[PDB]
Amino acid sequence: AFRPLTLPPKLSLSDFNEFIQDIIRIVGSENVEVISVDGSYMKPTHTHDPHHVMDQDYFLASAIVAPRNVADVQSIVGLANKFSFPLWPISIGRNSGYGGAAPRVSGSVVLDMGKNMNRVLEVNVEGAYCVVEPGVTYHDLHNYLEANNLRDKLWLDVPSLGGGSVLGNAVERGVGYTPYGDHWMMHSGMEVVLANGELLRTGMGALPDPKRPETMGLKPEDQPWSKIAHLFPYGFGPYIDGLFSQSNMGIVTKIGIWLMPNPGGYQSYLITLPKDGDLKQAVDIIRPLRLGMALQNVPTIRHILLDAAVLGDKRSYSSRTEPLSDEELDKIAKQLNLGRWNFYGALYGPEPIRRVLWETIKDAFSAIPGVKFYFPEDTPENSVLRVRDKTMQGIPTYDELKWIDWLPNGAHLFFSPIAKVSGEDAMMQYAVTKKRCQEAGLDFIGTFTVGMREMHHIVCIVFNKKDLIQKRKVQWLMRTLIDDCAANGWGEYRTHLAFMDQIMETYNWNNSSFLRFNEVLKNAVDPNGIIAPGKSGVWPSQYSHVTWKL
């Protein structure tokens, strides 16, 4: 196809068309689509930002291409290297809040890996792990195991929603809420197509499975892996694996995620904290608990509007357009039988063990006036506890997409700085976030996910995508929170297309040595600057900073 909406830098119409036709000879017109529509979460767009804050066609594909197999990606990349055409790889494209599917460089080809490179590749019981392709969604994976009755043997770890990509999410350093919740740390043995087009597999993946009759003549992509590939991540020598989480260093075609065995015993719970400032005490109680392993999963402390919005849009709680009051927040908390902050956790294991931990937790949190403990059974049919009970045992659900509907054309955009597991730090962080929210005219909504020694504070910005005035406030709000948090010694762990440069400019110790070192590795492996110029603010040398920085 003929004439796109936006072309990639330095490319002519003539070169594009030659390339697209060459791409078509390889994947079929069935697998190619040229932009000459936001969609939903259940059927996600792939050409632009569905939760757009910039104009909606600001980060816009010139085409969507989707490989049949690993060999298609080799050929595509060769073709990108002939013409110098940028590729923006996706797995599912469910990254809304962070850019969705859009490419940082308008005009790139979005490479949809998920459409055809779909397969649950292996579910190994004794090593308790699985090998997945970009397309295996969490739901699918769930369903794979149900299909073979493996769910009494192995469990998954899922995010809040169930449609994301196990792989895609894992390269983003995404979080989940069971003991295996730190997705990135659960991996082992990834297969990459680099910017020169060669296929590499990390760690024990570089150790060839030995020759045998049945595996002769297979294309690299399709060979088995040696026994230890997905059991020990390190391999030998430099542990390059991390260079492929949040970066532009290659295209990931396989990945091993470790799976948590059935623990033989489970139970969710909800601790509710009455007062807005019970967050400080709450968190100080959580410090030793997490660090001491009484708290086994990644328990989350939710804000009250986060739970309220799951249950209903704001219109349903007030007709008021400006942020809610302190008093109304108490009144809504009381309505749902939730407190001002709500702590969510799960206990895992034999009853004897579960019993002791729970008693220890229960007693710790009893030090807060008015706290109330609930299991799933004790809460309304529609409660968040019953949704998270699914979530905290590896079952994917979609119930939590509703809070995105807080306001009319609800779009979320996440501000995600990390905080100490300490009441003071937390209050400080929230104190600053909260202020900016009310200056912009936005309800504050969020969650802290409790990591071992750190907390990921997901400030959940919901806004009206069809409101120019508001979109301008969020951009104002986001960059002001970047600066503020920066100024308090906190930085974001993950972000949106339009905030990457500002967040990478936050990580400037010793004159931005960190980004400088990254540019060296990027330009080395990608001489042409073809694999996603811009991710995490790393620009190859052919993208002038003055022209491309946001």
Ligand X SMILES: *Cc1cc2c(cc1C)nc1c(=O)[nH]c(=O)nc-1n2C[C@H](O)[C@H](O)[C@H](O)COP(=O)(O)OP(=O)(O)OC[C@H]1O[C@@H](n2cnc3c(N)ncnc32)[C@H](O)[C@@H]1O
Give the residue with the Cβ less far from a second copy, 144 or 493: 493
**What residue 169 binds from ligand EUG, ligand X, a second copy, none (CB within 5 to 8 A, per partner kind)?**
ligand X
d(CA 299, CA 289): 11
What is the residue type of 506?
A: T
d(CA 140, CA 299): 25
64 binds ligand X (CB under 6 A): no
* Token reading at 360: 């220890």
> Contact with ligand X (CB under 6 A): which of 4, 86, 89, 179?
89
Residues 453-482 that bind ligand EUG (CB under 6 A): 456, 458
Residues in the chain, total: 550
CB 232, min distance to a second copy, A: 4
493 catalytic? Reply is yes
d(CA 549, CA 499): 10
Residues 379-438 that bind ligand X (CB under 6 A): 400-401, 404, 412
**What residue 92 binds from ligand X, ligand EUG, a second copy, none (CB within 5 to 8 A, per partner kind)?**
ligand X
Helix (H, G, I), strand (E, B) or coil at 421: coil
201 binds ligand EUG (CB under 6 A): no
Single out the catalytic residue among 41, 94, 98, 453.
Answer: 98
**What residue 274 binds from ligand X, ligand EUG, a second copy, none (CB within 5 to 8 A, per partner kind)?**
none
Site string for ligand EUG, 525-544 (x = CB under 6 A): --------------------
403 binds ligand EUG (CB under 6 A): no
Site string for ligand X, 134-163 (x = CB under 6 A): x------------------------xxx--
From residue 369, alpha-carbon distances to 271, 282, 335, 372 in Å are: 12, 11, 19, 9
The residue count for binding ligand EUG (CB under 6 A) is 11
Give the residue with the Cβ less far from ligand X, 245 or 275: 245
Neighbours of 135 (CB within 10 A): 22
Contacts of 142 (CB under 8 A, 6+ apart): 156, 158, 162, 394, 395, 396
Give the residue with the Cβ less far from ligand EUG, 79 or 401: 401
251 binds ligand X (CB under 6 A): yes
DSSP assignments along 450-488, one per residue:
E-SSEEEEEEEEEEETT-HHHHHHHHHHHHHHHHHHHHT
Handedness of CA 49, 54, 59, 60 (dihedral sign): positive
What is the residue type of 514?
A: F
201 catalytic? Reply is no
What is the residue type of 25?
A: R
Helix (H, G, I), strand (E, B) or coil at 353: helix
Single out the catalytic residue among 94, 201, 290, 494.
Answer: 494
Contacts of 211 (CB under 8 A, 6+ apart): none
Give the residue with the Cβ less far from a second copy, 460 or 486: 486
**What residue 42 binds from ligand EUG, a second copy, ligand X, none (CB within 5 to 8 A, per partner kind)?**
none
* Token reading at 534: 């811009």
Residues 89-128 that bind ligand EUG (CB under 6 A): 97
**What residue 43 binds from a second copy, ligand EUG, ligand X, none (CB within 5 to 8 A, per partner kind)?**
none
**What residue 447 binds from ligand X, a second copy, ligand EUG, none (CB within 5 to 8 A, per partner kind)?**
ligand EUG
494 catalytic? Reply is yes
Q: Which residues of 514-530 are buried (b: 16+ CB within 10 A; e: fewer)?
A: ebeebeeebbebbebbb
Residues 321-380 that bind ligand EUG (CB under 6 A): none
Helix axes 304-311, 326-336, angle to 10 degrees: 60
Helix (H, G, I), strand (E, B) or coil at 26: helix
397 binds ligand EUG (CB under 6 A): no
**What residue 165 binds from ligand EUG, ligand X, a second copy, none (CB within 5 to 8 A, per partner kind)?**
ligand X
d(CA 550, CA 545): 9
414 binds ligand EUG (CB under 6 A): yes
Tell me which residues are annotated as active site.
98, 493-494
Give me the residues that bind ligand EUG (CB under 6 A), please. 97, 160, 174-175, 414, 416, 447, 449, 456, 458, 494
